[PDB]
Amino acid sequence: MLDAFSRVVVNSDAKAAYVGGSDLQALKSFIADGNKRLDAVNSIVSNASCMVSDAVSGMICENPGLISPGGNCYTNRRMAACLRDGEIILRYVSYALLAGDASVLEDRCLNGLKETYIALGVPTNSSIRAVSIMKAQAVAFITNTATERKMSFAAGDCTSLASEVASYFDRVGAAIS
Amino acid sequence: MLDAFSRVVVNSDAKAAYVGGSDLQALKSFIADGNKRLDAVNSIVSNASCMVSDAVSGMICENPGLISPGGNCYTNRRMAACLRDGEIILRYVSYALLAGDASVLEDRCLNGLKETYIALGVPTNSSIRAVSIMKAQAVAFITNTATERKMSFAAGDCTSLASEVASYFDRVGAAIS
Amino acid sequence: MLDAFSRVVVNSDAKAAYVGGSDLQALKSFIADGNKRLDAVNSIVSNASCMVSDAVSGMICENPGLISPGGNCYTNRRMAACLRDGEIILRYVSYALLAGDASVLEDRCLNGLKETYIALGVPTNSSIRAVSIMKAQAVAFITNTATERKMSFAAGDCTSLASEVASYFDRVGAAIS
Amino acid sequence: MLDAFSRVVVNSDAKAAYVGGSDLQALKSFIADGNKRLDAVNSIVSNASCMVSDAVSGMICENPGLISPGGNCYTNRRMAACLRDGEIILRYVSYALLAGDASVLEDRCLNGLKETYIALGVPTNSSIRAVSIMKAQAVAFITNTATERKMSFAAGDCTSLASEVASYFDRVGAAIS
Amino acid sequence: MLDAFSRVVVNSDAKAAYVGGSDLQALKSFIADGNKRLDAVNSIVSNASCMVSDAVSGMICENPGLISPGGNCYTNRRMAACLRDGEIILRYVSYALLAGDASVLEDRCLNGLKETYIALGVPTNSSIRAVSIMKAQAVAFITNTATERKMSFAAGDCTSLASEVASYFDRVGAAIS
Amino acid sequence: MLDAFSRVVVNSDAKAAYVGGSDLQALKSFIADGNKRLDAVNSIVSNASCMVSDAVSGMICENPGLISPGGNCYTNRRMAACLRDGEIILRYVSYALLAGDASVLEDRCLNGLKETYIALGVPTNSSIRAVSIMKAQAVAFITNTATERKMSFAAGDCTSLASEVASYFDRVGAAIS
Amino acid sequence: MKSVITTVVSAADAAGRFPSNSDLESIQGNIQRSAARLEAAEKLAGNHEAVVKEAGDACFAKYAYLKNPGEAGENQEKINKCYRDVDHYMRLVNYCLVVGGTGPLDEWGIAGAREVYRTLNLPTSAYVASIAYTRDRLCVPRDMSAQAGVEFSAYLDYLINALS
Amino acid sequence: MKSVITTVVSAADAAGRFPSNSDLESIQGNIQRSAARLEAAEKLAGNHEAVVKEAGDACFAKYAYLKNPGEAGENQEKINKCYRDVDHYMRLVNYCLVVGGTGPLDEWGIAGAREVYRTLNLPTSAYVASIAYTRDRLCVPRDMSAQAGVEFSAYLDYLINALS
Amino acid sequence: MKSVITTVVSAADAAGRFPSNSDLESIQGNIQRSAARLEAAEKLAGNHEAVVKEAGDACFAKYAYLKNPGEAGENQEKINKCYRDVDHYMRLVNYCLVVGGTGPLDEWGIAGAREVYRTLNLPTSAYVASIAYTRDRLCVPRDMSAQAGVEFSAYLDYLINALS
Amino acid sequence: MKSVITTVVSAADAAGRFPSNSDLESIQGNIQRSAARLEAAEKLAGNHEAVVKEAGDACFAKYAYLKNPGEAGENQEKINKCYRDVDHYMRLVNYCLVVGGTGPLDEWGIAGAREVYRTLNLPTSAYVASIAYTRDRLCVPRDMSAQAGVEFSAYLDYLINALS
Amino acid sequence: MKSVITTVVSAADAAGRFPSNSDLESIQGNIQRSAARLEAAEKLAGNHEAVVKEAGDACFAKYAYLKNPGEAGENQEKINKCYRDVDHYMRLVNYCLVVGGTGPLDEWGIAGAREVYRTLNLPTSAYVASIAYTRDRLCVPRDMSAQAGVEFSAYLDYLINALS
Amino acid sequence: MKSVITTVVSAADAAGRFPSNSDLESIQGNIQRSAARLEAAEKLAGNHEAVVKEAGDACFAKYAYLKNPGEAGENQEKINKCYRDVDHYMRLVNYCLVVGGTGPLDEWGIAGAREVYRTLNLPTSAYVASIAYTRDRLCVPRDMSAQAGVEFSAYLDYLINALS
Known part of the structure; x- marks a missing residue:
């Protein structure tokens, strides 16, 4: 690509x-700062199942609308769907971060994404909640400001990487919009 | 299903x-009345080739427009087509009658049916003639009011089955429309 | 077909x-005049790589707009594309000439051609230049009015074949338009 | 079949x-005694994962030879293999028991079975241990002589079914030999 | 080929x-004598269903051993088999006769033929009866010595074609042996 | 692997x-000596088409037996075959050299190699000529003892790599035998 | 050979899964209805020498033109192998009675139906007309019960719908 | 629609390659033999109103039992659509004459052959018997030449081999 | 959604053929046995608020270590969504009761079983242990009959064999 | 067995093409970093008899309910094969240390992960909790360097992310 | 080996059907035109020792730089195997003359064309230039007739269009 | 566009799995060696106007026959588009320098190599001979270092091995 x-x-x-x-x-x-990017991205692969578990559990925290019976996403087949529908884009934003380029999403996973999701009937407000709270947790997770998940690094400034990952996140956040 | x-x-x-x-x-x-449905449906499997032969021969009776040369359905390849295009939906309305439910047609055989038939160029007036005369013959054939095809049953009322098969027939008659 | x-x-x-x-x-x-058509078409298979080489080289002669950097067709992958995108329609107009019928293009290679080329972003002015100069060279090449490529024939009139190939060429020239 | x-x-x-x-x-x-066979076979579907777990755990009980490192079956990929290689023949002996006929094994799963297993290098002594202890547990499980898994039946004689399942078991036990 | x-x-x-x-x-x-071969082979395509009907009916004439119950070929599925198993080699010996060469049988239909037929359990004595009587009828049918099936030809000698078809017939008769 | x-x-x-x-x-x-292996293997990728051209041209030098008409390898389809049949094993011995292990040939390209080549009818004396002269040229090419192809290195001893590549070469030379 | 029971083991192959209650009441219907099936077949074996002389000779009453050669019944040996043909016809409907499924119909009468006597130059119109005599030729208070004769009718008319 | 020429362009599709001399003499045979083909078809159009009254009425001479209802010729409107049926039969053999290839046989007479009048309850035995009258019913010094009448015979007997 | 009846229409799709007697007695078993099935489900809806407080709290009697964070039951909101979890567990066994087939088991409890709480870090051992309390927790003279309670047992133990 | 080097030869298989500089610096990183990798594994073999008695007995401190039969640790032979289980657990993380690639993770710990102790009725929650003790249980100035211990942490936490 | 006749038997394989008149006039064109083909090949065998010394030495007149090593004609043994190369070149155009089809072109000159002397470091520009001398080097009143020399030209220029 | 990094994300697509240490040291080699790569390209842009007049005019010293029409260099506009051709040749080797992977070789010089100037009637022998001047035309103590010039040599000779 x-x-x-x-x-x-x-x-x-x-x-x-x-x-x-x-x-x-x-x-x-x-x-x-390639080693600085490597210092970022192994923190991202550390708790990816915790990343998607935090994302989906917060989505049931301030939204009970999906888990309403007869709602959109209230079946375990559909929680397995946003298992996938979260994790593979987490894979893809890891791919954009390792490339250092946003050329691997809209050609790759958003080839007409939301049109197919409206054909699936997916409400967009759930989606923008999902990508925003995964954005805020991922900028919390590239730095060492976790609960106690305090990995060892060389100390200094790395906010260029925060502006990097947020740029990929509103690129996907606009292209899902 | x-x-x-x-x-x-x-x-x-x-x-x-x-x-x-x-x-x-x-x-x-x-x-x-499950035995009553079985008393209905073995009359339906008795003369299925006579059902589709009556349907296509009456279609040439008061329509010569298909068998016009250079018309829609004037070739034996296309009479083999509405051999199929009658018989497999007769199979499918037998499936709706054995299920007792109309969930096995529009998902099954009418997945965008008439759009493909307009892509084939099939005129709808021939189709609505076909399904209506097969509807009237099928309600004649679930009861014992044939010419002399007088099968043995236990006598009584069975008009709930007539309201059953006619409901499947205008479901397919509207969904081909 | x-x-x-x-x-x-x-x-x-x-x-x-x-x-x-x-x-x-x-x-x-x-x-x-079937032997006359055979007298035509072996001249067409003689210099087909010279036909497409003349076509693409004249396209860079009075157009530098494709070979502009950041232009439409300025990459060798895209000159390999109008290698193909010339040669296979030269194959197809040879097929129309051997059939004696224009039924083997729009069903065969122009099944929604230019809509896909606009989806590829191909400018039509390059295309109409390509088919016109290949038209003029092909009517020069069915006769023996080449530079010195003077094949042996039986002499006489063969302008019905020129009206044949030009009819196929503005059929493709209109259907690419 | x-x-x-x-x-x-x-x-x-x-x-x-x-x-x-x-x-x-x-x-x-x-x-x-078709209801008697149904009284047998729902006891068989009750603890099928317990059936194959008992079979493989007893195979490590008096054989440590498979779980020897560098042995035949000492990897979890190969314990997933005799997960399958036990369970699908348990499915097949359930199929022979519901058919009441031994025509669904050697055509179905033993189409040259042990020749392929010798090509895989599977030792036969492990296999005959596996089918024997699954035979003895299955005749313990068609009757109500379990630990406390005491399902409700109509009481009486059912040893014809024990001679049935043992006949299928030495048919597979000879055809794996 | x-x-x-x-x-x-x-x-x-x-x-x-x-x-x-x-x-x-x-x-x-x-x-x-290519027209002489064409004068032969349209007599062969004239009564091909009569050829295979004569072949199978004579096979029940002096053999009742196939139609013995529990025999080899006593089912209509197996008479449909030597419908095929006669007719497609009649197609293939027509192919050898139109090629003028025996290169289109053993590569084409006898790629290990009789080994698969012994795997099917086909007795060879039935096979050699079948190819023999179809050989004798085919040399009767290339000439005009039928019952009254007297097609029009140009008269003369054509026994080179009889030596042609018999050479293909003992090539297949030995290669089925 | x-x-x-x-x-x-x-x-x-x-x-x-x-x-x-x-x-x-x-x-x-x-x-x-991993950099020493890298100092070896970029010399190997330098003249791989010259490697296979030297191999096949020396094979016609002291053998005219393949290029004999009606011989084994006298067609350009078969010189394209030992284009492939040389180059992909040159790829594979490069793979064994980068792995530092001979586990990527007999599982990979010699899965029953010479049995299939005898089924193709390939004479082994041509093969052992091919692998031996490619062995002698490859040990000439890992060092800087070419004609004038004098790449720059750090000087010293590297004969451990010569014993490495020769071990892979008689492993393939015995396994083609 | 297709039965009901064969279809649900192949359904459990198509699932690749366990015998649930897809199975477990199809057999219980055979506890009722295959017990209500078997009783016809003794007079079906009992009439088997005499249903031929009504049905095939009524097809001779249908089709009597057969004297000319190049046609089917040009000698009497063809006529007694017509008798041999329809012998196995009601013998196979005895077989698909006692299995229930259409396997002995399908692979043993229908596999090789549409083309076989086409190439052997014989019409199936008499093959359907003799059995068209045996349509309502049955007596549900009198020959056997009304609980299997209509199913027996359904057996050999699915045969004709397959033949047509 | 299959011709000879259609097969070799699809052969050049199956190759995906150029027109070589696979093509270039199949057409030259049509310079000889399609010129030797066309001359029959004017009396084929000229006899087209009269070959029906010999052939279909000889099939009535073959099959005359048709008075009973539940059969095919129970009224005379069935008989004049028999005439309408065989009208298009020799009209289609006029068509596969002038193309040469079996496309108007295959997709236009054979696509829908084996099952259609099976389900419409009509035998193809009369459909082959009327054309079995027209087997040797031709005269190679006298009707037309000996250079296309045997091919005309081959046309409508490949039709019957397809029908059988 | 798989039922028995869904499997035999898809069997008639896999045949591509007509409804024979593969169908016609699987429904008659539902005339007996689905009539013998429905009567449990009213007390299954009647006990649905109280089977949770025995089973999930017996799994708390099984698994009581949950105070530490990084584990599953570190707050009581996790405990009342355990109650919400098993609510839909016996609601789904109410559903696969009344269909008979394992469709609401398969696509609605088993599609997404082997990996879901693996990644959500929850054991299925309590998911099988609460239902392992409800193994023989039934009374065939006393709760309901002996004609559906063993099948009800077979329903939710095929569930556990799927969960194991 | 996947390594880095195995992936790029299979990348050169997926290309079907020559070793370019896709290869030629992945190995040079192993000249730096696999030299910076190997030094842990001697105390990993040196602690291998003692990391079991902290981790598995802390999982007994996690999970101590195991006295009842029908559960996993109902006898002490189950407990010393727990010791045998986790023996090969840090032996395999010794192996995927020294290859670098996740092949001895994938085909040798993960091929057969999601279902195996599901059917063998054992939770992976203790399988993740013992290694959750060994998360930050490391000392980057003090046990070994800060150049491979976080990677060692990344090794056995990709293991747990695979296990979860 | 492709001929015209090979294509129509494989067309009858692709049909899986009978030899119709797709075949039956492609051979009759060979009765005219292969009889009009054969007469060139005796002087093609008669000039075969002398067309090499005009064409290959005119390619030496085209390409004379070959003294330097690392190039193709650095010794005279390379030059007499150039003679051996083009020997089989007009021997193969003798072969695809007498078959007609492009099989001895395709599988025997073109199978292994685009890459072979690419890897053997030889240009096909001389391989087309020597035959570009033999374009109009023919005499249709004088060498042979005007009925096969343009086809002979078409033979070895389809060769060059394949080479280009 | 293939790089090293593109191959390992597509390796992680072919796995469909997570970035392990297949990735994590291929980039660290670029920390050493792509830093040791970039320094040539300024004189590669600095000599880009003058490497053409040595190499293409040495190919005119190789190939000087071009005066005749029907050949390639029959006018001087062909000669200055030779200059335009090789301009983008070392511009593309500037590009596959700075990516490392062979993507700008493969899809941008090799996709369309084997046939393009074959049909455009131009030899690649001069396309390899000008770069064969630039084989050892480099100076590893003197032009640039010995740490990237042999790799620069490997870049544009993989180009020629692709061209041959």
Whole structure:
């Protein structure tokens, strides 16, 4: 598909220009914090089942509307559905974070996503609740501000990674809208 | 798929209610005339090739428009088509009659039926002629009012079965419309 | 599919009429010049890679708009595309010429062609340039008016074949429009 | 496939003889104890996971040779194999018991069974231990001589069913040999 | 596959020799009697259902051993089998006769034929009776020595075609042996 | 599949022993020359088409027996075959060299290799010529003793890698035998 | 060979799953109704030598043109193998009586129906007309009961609906 | 609609490849033989009103039992639609004459052959017997030539081999 | 939703064929036995508020360690949604009672069984132990008859064999 | 057996193509980091007889109800095969340490995870709780370095995420 | 080996059906035109020792740079196996003359065309240029007739269109 | 567009599973070696106007016959689009430098390699000969380091092995 190392080529050959020492300061400072991205993403793979369990349990916390009988998502077949329908996009936002590029969602999992979900009858207010609380927990989880899940790192600033993951989250949050 | 023994469950769990002694008078009086339904349906399997032969021959009786050369249905490949296109829905209305439920047609054989037939170019006036004269012959054939095809039964009232088969016939007659 | 020997049947059974001695003067004078069609079509298979090479090289001659960087068709993957997207319709117009009938294009390769090409984003002005210069070269190539590619024939009149191939070419030229 | 109601036909047409009042005393006394077979087989579906758990746990009780490291069956992939390799033949001996006929094993699951198991390298002594202890537990389980799993029946003699299930068990025990 | 026009190539390139004016006298005298082969083979397609009906009815004439109850071929499923098991090899010997070459049987229909028939349990004496009497009837049927089925030909000698079809028949008769 | 890091586990659990500080001196001195293996294997990917071109051209140098007309390998379809039949095992011996283990050939490409080649009729003397001259050229090509293909390395001893690749080559040379 | 019981074990193969109560009352209906089935078949074996001379000779009363060669009944040996044909016809309806399922109909009368006497040049119109004599040729107070004769009628008319 | 020419373009589809000399002499045989084919069809249109009254009435000479109801020819309107049936029968053999290929046989007479009048309760034995009158009913020095009448015979007997 | 009747229409789909007597006595067993089935379900709805406080609290008698966080019952809201969980458990066994087939077991309790509380970190051992209290907790002369209580036992133990 | 190196040869199989620089720096990371990996495993073999008596007995401190039969720990032979179970648990995490890839996790601990002790009636909640003791039970200045202990933590917590 | 006749038997395999008049005039065109084909091939065998020294040496007149090693014609043994190469080139066009079909082109010159001398580092531009000398190098009143030389031209230019 | 990182996410698609340590050290090799990669590309952009006049004019020194029409370089506009051709050739090797993976080789130089100038009648022998000048035309103490120039050599010789 595509990467941050690739969309620098797609605008370069859109101009027939060089790739070289004009975007290069972003390029070496991309890979200067590659270990910082690795310091982020192994925290993400640590509690992924806890991530999706927190997401679905908070969705029953301030919404009982799905678990209403005869509602949208009140069957264990449909909780297995938003088992999948949460976890595989968590896989995909991990893929966008390892690529450093948002080119692996709308081509990949949102190929006409919400049109098929309206064909399934999925209400969007549940969806925007799901992606927002998973957004807020994922920015809590890239840093070491958990309950006591205090992994060891080298200390310093890493808020560029928070602006990274939130950009992927409102990209998916708008494209599910 | 579904049954009359099943849609009593689907509205029960739509309410989270019981199934039990509220619809039960319809339930035991469903199976009180189960032998009456068997007395009906073996008359239906008796002359099924005569059923579809009567249907297609009456369709050439007061319509010569299909058998017009360069018409819709004037080839033996297309009379083999409404061989099939009559007989398999006769199979399906036998399935609705043995289930006691109309849940086995529109999911089963009318999954977008007439849209594909308009894509085949089938005129609807021939279709509504076909299902109406097969409706009138099938209500003539569940009772013993044939020419001399006088099978042996236990005598009495069975007009609830006539209201049963006609309900399946205008369900298919509206859903082909 | 269909043929000139077949559409004489499809209008005959549209009337329930004969096929016989009413179109027969066109029929024997179809096969009187069958060797003339063979004298045409082996000239067409002689330089098919030269046909598509002339077509694409003239398309870069008076259009640099495709080969503009960030343009439509400026990649070798897309020149391999109009390798295919020229050659297989050259195969198909050879099929229409051997059938003597235009029934093997719009059912075969133009099943919603340009709608998919607009979904691919293909500009139509490049397409009409491509089919026109391949039309003019193909009428130059059915006759022996090449540079020095002077194959041996029996001499005489063959302009009915030129009216044949041009009819297939504006049929595809209108159906790509 | 075949049945006890079917092999009475296959020897009848082997003689071109009747089926009728020569084997009929076995036929009505087959269906006289059909409720007795139903009284047997719902005890079999009661503890099928307990049946295969008892079988595999006793196989580790007086054999540690499979669970030897680098042995035959010492991996959980292979205990999932004799999960399957026990349970589906328990399904099949339930099928032979509901048919009342041994025609649904060697055509069905033993189509060259042990040759493929020797190609898998399965030792036969483990297999004959498995089918023997599942035989002895299944004849303990068709009757009500369990630990306290005391289902309710109508009391009387049912040892014809014990001779039935043991005949299926040494048929599979010889055909795995 | 292969042809008489092809095995002259396979021995030519086995020598790296020419094909040309050494086998050519057989080649033009092959196609000199091509109309004679066509005069043969439309007599073969005339009574193919009569060919296989004569073959199977004579097989019950001097053999009642198949139609013995509990015999090999005494069921209408198995008479439908040697419906097929006669007719498709009649198709194949028609293919060998139109090719003028015996390269379309043992690769095509006798890919391990009789081994599978012994796996089906087919007795060979029935088979050699079947191919023998179909051989004698086919050499009676390529000529005009029928009962009154007297088609019109140009008269003369055609016994080279009788030596042709008999060579294909003992090729299949040995390869079923 | 398996690796040198894996067969140290398969003999460890064959003993239920540790993996640790008994084979560890081979383990750290495996990865001490990992850059040395990388210094070897990029020389192997440099002239792989030259490797297989040298192999097949030397095979026509002192053998004209394949290119004999009507021989084994005298067609360009069969030179495309030992295009493949050389190059994919060159891929596979590159896979054995990157794994550091011979577990990726006989399971992978020699699953009954020569039995199928005798079924194809491939003579073994051509094969042993092919693998031996590709062996001698590959040990010439892991070092810098080419014609002038003098890549830059860090100098020193690397004959452990020569004993590595020759061990894979007589493993395939015996298993093709 | 299809029965009811064969269909539900293959349903338990198509599920790949356990025998539930899909099975467990189809057999109990055979405790009632196969006990109510068996009693016809003794006079079906008892009339088996005489139902041929009514039905096949009524098809000769239907179809009597057969003297000319190139047709089916051009000799009397063809006529006594007509008798041999319909012998196994009511012998097979004796068989699909006592199994219940349509297996001895399907694989043993219908597998090889639509084409066989087409290529053997024989019409199935007499094959349906003799059994069309035996439509209402039954007596539900008098031959046997009214509890299996209509099912016996349903047996050999599913045969004709298969033949047509 | 299958012809010879349709088969070799679909052969060039099954190859997915170019028109070679698989094509280039099948048409040249039509330069000889389709020119030697067309001349019958004018008297085939010329006899088309009279081949019905020999063939269908010879099938009435074959099959004359039809007075009884529940059978096929119980009224004369059935008899004049027999005439309408066989009208399109030799009209279709006029069609598969002039194409050569068996497409108007296959999709237009054979697609819907084995079951259609089975369910419509009509025998194909008269459908083969009328054309069995027209087997050798032809005259190769006298009606037309000996170069297409045996092929015309081959046309409508492949029809009967398909019908049988 | 699987029933018995759903399996035999899909058997008639897998045949693609007509309703024979594969069907016609499976329903007659429901004339006997579904009439002998329905009578339990009123006290099953009648005990539905009280079978929870025996079974789930006996699973608290089984599993009482739940005070520590990171485990399942660390607050009482988890305990009253345990009550909400098993509420729909005997409500679904009320449902697969009245259909007979295992459809409301399979697609509605078993589709999403083997992995769901695995990932939601809850054991099914209490999910089988509460129903293991309700094994022989029934009275065949006294609660209801001996004609459906063993089948009711078979219903919710096929549930546990599916859960195990 | 999946490693990193196994994935890129199968990537070169999925390409069917040559080893490029997809390969050529994944190994160089093992020159750094597998050299930074190996040093834990000697005390992992050194503590292997003593991590069992903390972890499994803390799961007995978690789960102590096991005296009753029909449950898992009803005799002490079950308890010493619990010790035998978790013996191979940290022996397999020794194995997927030294390969790096998750092959000895996947085919050797996870192939047969979701159903095996479900049917063998054992909870994986203790199987995750003993390793939940060994979450932060490590000392990155003190046991070993901070360069592989968090990866060791990542090894056996991908194990638990697989187990959950 | 593809011919015309091979394509129509495989068309009768793709039909699975009988030889109709799809066949029966493709052979009659060979009665005309294969008789009009054969006469060239004796001087094609007669010039076979001399067409090499014009065509390959005109490709040396085209491509004469070959002295340097690492290229194709660096020794004269490469040059006389160029002669051996094009020997079988016009020997194969002798073969696909006398079959007509493109089988000895396809499986014997084209199966292994696009990649073989790519990997053997030889250009097909000389392989097309020598035959590009033999384009109009023919004389239709003078070498042979005008009835097969343009087809001979079509033979070895379909070869070049395949090579290009 | 294939990279190393693209292959391991598609490996995690082919697994359908989680990012383990198949990933987690392929990137760390890029921390070493892609930092050791980037430094060439500025003189690759710096020589990009002058590597054309050595390489393409040395291919004119290789191939100088081009004056005749019907060949490739018959006018000078063909010669300056040769310059335009090889412009994008080292521009693409600048691109597959900085990605590492062979995606801009494969889909952007090799997708459409084996047939394109075959049909456009141009040899790839000059396309390999100009880059065969740039084989050892590099200086590992002097142009750039010995840590990426052999890899740069490996880049554009995998290109030629793909072109051959």
